[PDB]
Coordinates of C-alpha atoms and ligand atoms in Angstrom, one line a residue:
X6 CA -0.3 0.1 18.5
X7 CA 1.1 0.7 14.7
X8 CA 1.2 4.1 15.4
X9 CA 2.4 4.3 19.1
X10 CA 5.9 4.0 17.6
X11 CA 5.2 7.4 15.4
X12 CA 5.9 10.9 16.8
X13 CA 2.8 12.5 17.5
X14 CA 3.8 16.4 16.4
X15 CA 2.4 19.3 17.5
X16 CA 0.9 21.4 15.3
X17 CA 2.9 24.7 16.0
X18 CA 6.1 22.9 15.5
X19 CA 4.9 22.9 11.7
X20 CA 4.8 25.4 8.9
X21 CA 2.7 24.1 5.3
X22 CA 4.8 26.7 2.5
X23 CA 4.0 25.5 -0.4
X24 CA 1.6 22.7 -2.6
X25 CA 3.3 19.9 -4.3
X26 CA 0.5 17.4 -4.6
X27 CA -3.0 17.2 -4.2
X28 CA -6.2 15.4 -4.4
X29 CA -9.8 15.7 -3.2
X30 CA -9.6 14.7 0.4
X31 CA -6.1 16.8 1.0
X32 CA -2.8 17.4 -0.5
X33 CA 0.7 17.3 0.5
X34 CA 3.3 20.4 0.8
X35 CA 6.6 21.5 1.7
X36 CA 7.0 22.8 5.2
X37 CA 9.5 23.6 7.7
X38 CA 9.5 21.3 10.9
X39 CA 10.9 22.0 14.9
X46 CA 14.3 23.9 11.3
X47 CA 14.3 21.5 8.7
X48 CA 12.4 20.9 5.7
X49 CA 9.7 18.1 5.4
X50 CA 6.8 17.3 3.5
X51 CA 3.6 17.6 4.8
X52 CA 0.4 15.2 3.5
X53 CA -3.1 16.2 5.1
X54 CA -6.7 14.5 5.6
X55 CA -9.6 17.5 5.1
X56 CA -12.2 17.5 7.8
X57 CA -15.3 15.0 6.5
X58 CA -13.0 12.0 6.1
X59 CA -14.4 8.2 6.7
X60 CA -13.3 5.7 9.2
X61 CA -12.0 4.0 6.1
X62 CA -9.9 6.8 4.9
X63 CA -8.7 7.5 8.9
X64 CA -7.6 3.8 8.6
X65 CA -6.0 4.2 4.9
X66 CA -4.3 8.2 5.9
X67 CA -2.8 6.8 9.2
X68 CA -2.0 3.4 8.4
X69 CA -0.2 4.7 5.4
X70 CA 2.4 6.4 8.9
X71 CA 2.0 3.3 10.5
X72 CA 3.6 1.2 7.7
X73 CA 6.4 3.4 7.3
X74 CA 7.0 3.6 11.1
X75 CA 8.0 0.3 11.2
X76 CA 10.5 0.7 8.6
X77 CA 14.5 2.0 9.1
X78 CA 16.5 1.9 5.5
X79 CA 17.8 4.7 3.7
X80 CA 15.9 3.7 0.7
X81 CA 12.5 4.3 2.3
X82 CA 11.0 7.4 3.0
X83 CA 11.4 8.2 6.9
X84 CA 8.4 9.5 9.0
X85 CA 9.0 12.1 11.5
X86 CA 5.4 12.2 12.7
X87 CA 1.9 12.6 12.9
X88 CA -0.6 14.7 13.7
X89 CA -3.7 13.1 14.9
X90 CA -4.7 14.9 18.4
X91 CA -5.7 18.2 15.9
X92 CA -7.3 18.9 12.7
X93 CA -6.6 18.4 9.8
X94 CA -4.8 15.7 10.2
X95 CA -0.9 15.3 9.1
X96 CA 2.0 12.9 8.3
X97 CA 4.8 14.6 8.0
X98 CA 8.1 12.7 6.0
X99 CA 12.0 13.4 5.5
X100 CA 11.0 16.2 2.1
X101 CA 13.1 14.4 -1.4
X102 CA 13.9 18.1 -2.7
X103 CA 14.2 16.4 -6.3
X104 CA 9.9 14.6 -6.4
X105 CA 9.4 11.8 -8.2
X106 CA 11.4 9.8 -10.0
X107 CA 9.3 9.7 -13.8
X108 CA 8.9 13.0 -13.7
X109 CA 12.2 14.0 -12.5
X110 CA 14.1 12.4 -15.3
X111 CA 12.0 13.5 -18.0
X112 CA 12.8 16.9 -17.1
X113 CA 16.8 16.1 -16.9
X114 CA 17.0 13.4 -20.0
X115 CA 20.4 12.7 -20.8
X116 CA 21.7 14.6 -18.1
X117 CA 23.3 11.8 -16.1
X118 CA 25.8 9.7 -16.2
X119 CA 25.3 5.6 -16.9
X120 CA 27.0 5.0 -13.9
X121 CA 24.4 7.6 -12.3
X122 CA 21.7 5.8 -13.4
X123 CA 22.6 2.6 -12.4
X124 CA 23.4 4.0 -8.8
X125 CA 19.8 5.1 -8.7
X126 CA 18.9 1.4 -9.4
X127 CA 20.7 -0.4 -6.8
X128 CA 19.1 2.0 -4.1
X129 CA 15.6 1.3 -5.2
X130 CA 16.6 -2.4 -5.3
X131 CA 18.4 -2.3 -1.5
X132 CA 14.7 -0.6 -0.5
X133 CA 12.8 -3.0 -2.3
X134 CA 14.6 -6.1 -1.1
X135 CA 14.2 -4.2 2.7
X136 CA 10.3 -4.1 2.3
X137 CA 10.5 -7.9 0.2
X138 CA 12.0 -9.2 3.6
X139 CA 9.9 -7.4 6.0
X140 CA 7.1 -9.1 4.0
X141 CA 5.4 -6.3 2.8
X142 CA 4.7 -6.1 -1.1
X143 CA 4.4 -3.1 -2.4
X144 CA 2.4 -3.5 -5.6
X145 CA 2.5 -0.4 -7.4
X146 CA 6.3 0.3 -7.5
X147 CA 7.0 2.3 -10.9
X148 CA 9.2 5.5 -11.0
X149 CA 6.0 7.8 -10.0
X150 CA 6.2 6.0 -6.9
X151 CA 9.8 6.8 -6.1
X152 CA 11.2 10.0 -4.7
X153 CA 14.7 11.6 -5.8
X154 CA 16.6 13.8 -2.9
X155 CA 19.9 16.2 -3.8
X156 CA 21.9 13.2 -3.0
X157 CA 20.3 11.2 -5.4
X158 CA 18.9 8.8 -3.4
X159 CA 16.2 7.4 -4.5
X160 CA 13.7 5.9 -1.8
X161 CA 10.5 3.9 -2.3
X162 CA 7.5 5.2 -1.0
X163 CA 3.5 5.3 -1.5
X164 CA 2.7 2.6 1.4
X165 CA -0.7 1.1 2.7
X166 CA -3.6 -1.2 2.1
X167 CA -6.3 -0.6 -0.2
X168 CA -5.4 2.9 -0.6
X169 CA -2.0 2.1 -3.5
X170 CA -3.9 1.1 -5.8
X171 CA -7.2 3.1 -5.5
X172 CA -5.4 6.2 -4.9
X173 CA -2.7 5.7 -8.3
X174 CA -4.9 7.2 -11.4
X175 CA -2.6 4.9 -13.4
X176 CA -4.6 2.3 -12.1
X177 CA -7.6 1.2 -14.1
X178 CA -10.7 -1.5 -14.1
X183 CA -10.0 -5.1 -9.8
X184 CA -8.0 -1.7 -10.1
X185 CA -4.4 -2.3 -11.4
X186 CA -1.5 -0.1 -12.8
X187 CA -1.6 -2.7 -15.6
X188 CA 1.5 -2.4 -17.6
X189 CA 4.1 -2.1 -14.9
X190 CA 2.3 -5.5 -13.4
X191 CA 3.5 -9.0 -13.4
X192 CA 1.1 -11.4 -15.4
X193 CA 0.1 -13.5 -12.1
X194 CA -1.3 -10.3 -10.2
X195 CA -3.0 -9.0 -13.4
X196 CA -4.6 -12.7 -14.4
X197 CA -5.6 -14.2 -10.7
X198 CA -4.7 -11.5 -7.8
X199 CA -1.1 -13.2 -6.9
X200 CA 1.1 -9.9 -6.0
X201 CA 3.9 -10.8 -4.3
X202 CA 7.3 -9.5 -4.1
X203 CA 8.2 -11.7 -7.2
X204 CA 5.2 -9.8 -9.1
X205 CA 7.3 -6.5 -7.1
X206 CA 10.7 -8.0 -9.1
X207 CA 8.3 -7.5 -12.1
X208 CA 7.2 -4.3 -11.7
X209 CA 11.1 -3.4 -11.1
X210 CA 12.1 -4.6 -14.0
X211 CA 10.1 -2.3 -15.8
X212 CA 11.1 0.5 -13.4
X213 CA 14.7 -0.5 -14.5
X214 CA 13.4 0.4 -18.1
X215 CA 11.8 3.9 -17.3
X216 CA 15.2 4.9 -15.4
X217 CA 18.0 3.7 -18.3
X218 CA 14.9 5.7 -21.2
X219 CA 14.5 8.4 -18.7
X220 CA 11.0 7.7 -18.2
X221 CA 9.9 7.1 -21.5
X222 CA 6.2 5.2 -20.7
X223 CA 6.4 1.7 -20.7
X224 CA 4.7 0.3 -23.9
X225 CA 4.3 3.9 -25.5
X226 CA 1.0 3.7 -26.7
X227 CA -0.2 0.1 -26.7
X228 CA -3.2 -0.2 -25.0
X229 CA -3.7 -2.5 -21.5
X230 CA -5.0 -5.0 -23.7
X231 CA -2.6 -4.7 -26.9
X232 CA 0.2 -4.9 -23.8
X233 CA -1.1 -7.9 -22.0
X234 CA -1.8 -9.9 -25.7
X235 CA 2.3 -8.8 -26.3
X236 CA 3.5 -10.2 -23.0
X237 CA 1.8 -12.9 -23.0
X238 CA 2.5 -14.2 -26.7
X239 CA 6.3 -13.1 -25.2
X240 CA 7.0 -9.9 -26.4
X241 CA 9.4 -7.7 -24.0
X242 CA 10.2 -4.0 -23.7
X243 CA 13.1 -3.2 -26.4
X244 CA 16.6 -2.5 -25.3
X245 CA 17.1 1.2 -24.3
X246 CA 19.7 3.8 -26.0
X247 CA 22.8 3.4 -24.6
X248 CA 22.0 0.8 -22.0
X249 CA 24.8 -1.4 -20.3
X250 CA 24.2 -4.7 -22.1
X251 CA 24.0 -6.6 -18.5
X252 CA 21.5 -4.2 -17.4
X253 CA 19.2 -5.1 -20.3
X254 CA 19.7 -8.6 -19.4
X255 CA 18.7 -8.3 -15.9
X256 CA 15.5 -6.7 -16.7
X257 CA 15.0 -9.1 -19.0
X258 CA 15.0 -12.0 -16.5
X259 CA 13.1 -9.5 -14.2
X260 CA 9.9 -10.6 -16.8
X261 CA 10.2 -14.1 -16.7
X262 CA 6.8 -15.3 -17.2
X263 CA 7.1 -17.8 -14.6
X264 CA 7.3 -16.1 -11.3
X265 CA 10.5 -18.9 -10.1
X266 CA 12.6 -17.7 -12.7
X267 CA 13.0 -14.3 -11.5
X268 CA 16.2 -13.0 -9.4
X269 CA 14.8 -12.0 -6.7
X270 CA 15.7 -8.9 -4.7
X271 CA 18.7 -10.3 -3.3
X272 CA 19.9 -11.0 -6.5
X273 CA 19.4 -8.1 -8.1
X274 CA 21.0 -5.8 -5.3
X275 CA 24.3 -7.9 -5.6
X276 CA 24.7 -7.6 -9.6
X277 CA 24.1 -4.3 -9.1
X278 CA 27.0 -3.8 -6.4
X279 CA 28.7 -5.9 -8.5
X280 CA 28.5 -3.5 -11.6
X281 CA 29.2 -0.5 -9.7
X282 CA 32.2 -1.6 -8.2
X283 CA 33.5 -2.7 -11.7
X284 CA 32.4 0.1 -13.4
X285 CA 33.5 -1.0 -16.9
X286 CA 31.4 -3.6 -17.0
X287 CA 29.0 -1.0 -17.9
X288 CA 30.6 0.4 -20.9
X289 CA 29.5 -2.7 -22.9
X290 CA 26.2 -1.8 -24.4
X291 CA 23.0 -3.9 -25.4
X292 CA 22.6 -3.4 -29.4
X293 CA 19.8 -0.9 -29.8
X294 CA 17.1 -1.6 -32.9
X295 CA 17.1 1.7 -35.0
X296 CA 13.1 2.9 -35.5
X297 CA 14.4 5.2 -38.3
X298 CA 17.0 4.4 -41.0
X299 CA 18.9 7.7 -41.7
X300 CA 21.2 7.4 -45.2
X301 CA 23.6 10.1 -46.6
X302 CA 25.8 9.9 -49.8
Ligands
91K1 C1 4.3 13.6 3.5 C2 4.1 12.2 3.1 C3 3.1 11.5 3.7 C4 2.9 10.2 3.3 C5 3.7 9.6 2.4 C6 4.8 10.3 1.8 CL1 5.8 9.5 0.7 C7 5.0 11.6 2.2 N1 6.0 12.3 1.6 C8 5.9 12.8 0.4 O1 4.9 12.7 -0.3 C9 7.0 13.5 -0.2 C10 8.3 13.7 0.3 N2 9.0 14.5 -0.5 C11 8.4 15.0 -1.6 N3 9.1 15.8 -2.4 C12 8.5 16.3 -3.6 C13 7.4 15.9 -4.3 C14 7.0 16.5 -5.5 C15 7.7 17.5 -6.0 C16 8.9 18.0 -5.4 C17 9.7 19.0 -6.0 O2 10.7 18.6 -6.6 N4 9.4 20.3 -6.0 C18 8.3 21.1 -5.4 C19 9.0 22.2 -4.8 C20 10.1 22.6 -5.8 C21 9.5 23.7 -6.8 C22 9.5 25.0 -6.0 O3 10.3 25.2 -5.1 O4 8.7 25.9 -6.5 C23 10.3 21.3 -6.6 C24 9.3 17.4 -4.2 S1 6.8 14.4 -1.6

């Protein structure tokens, strides 16, 4: 009844052309679909009621959603084997990876842009009260508009299925202090974890932390210790990530917020040609 909204699809209407992900119990490609292009995620033969109910509650999560920063479902299929969920295909992947592999290629204004659209899909899923709790710039896809869209939904399966996670199982450095210390995740833990997603876009995906360790980063956030300002970084987009990790969760903007400083800057663009100082890790001198 989650998934009597999804398409079921049959499978002759889809064509699997190539891998661009993969795991033990499937992987996902690019396809054509009856033609557009899609991406294609399959469950191997073998699978567990408890990774049926993970794979196809992952479609029936995103069925219920409509916002052009989340990644649309065009259907299942479940009636044949192996199972499939096939999506809308981002022809740029994921976000972290995408923007280490196109550093300084953009335009502040570009960036920016990219964060307002993750912020309109986070504030969507905030208000149709589902927290995400993994949301980092793995987790979002780019398309050839630049649109970036959240996605990697379900249950138990975010956080188990993210190797960034680690031993509960948490992706530890992009997580709010409350989630990490006593299980509270929450869309103001998600208003955390963007904050530090605003940091990995403006560095283009430089890793959060570089190499602290889970422990070195939780002993520096919680004796108060924040990510550094980015190069080149519109000073009021430093500030807003700043507030984004307020130790106490009532301090933080929440979505709504951040969406309309966001509109806000884009629609005054100058505002972002004011820059946050940047603290020089190398002194270079010349008579
Ligand atoms: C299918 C599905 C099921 C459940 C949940 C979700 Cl979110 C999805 N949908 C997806 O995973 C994806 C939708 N779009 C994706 N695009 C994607 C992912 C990873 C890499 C790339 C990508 O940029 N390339 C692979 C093809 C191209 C390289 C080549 O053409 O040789 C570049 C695109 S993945």
């Amino acid at each position: 009844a989650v998934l009597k909204f999804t398409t079921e699809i049959h499978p002759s209407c889809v064509t699997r052309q190539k891998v661009i992900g993969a795991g033990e119990f499937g992987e996902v490609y690019k396809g054509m679909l009856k033609e557009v292009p899609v991406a294609i995620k399959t469950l191997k033969a073998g699978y567990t009621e408890k990774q049926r109910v993970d794979f196809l509650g992952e479609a029936g999560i995103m069925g219920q959603f409509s916002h052009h920063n989340i990644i649309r479902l065009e259907g299942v299929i479940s009636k044949y084997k192996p199972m499939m969920i096939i999506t809308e295909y981002m022809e740029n992947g994921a976000l972290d990876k995408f923007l280490r592999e196109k550093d300084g290629e953009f335009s502040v204004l570009q960036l920016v842009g990219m964060l307002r659209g993750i912020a309109a899909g986070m504030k969507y899923l905030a208000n149709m009260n589902y927290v995400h709790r993994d949301l980092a710039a793995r987790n979002i896809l780019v398309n050839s508009n630049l649109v970036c869209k959240v996605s990697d939904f379900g249950l138990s399966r975010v956080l188990e299925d993210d190797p960034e996670a680690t031993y509960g199982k948490i992706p530890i450095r992009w997580t709010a202090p409350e989630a990490i210390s006593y299980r509270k995740f929450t869309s103001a833990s998600d208003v955390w974890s963007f904050g530090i997603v605003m940091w990995e876009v403006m560095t283009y995906g430089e890793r959060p932390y570089w190499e602290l360790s889970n422990h070195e980063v939780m002993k520096a956030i919680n004796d108060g210790f924040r990510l550094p300002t980015p190069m080149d970084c519109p000073s009021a987009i430093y500030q807003l990530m700043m507030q984004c990790w307020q130790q106490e969760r009532a301090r933080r903007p929440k979505f709504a917020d951040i969406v309309s400083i966001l509109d806000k800057l884009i629609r005054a663009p100058d505002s972002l040609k004011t820059l946050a100082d940047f603290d020089p890790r190398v002194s270079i001198r010349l008579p």
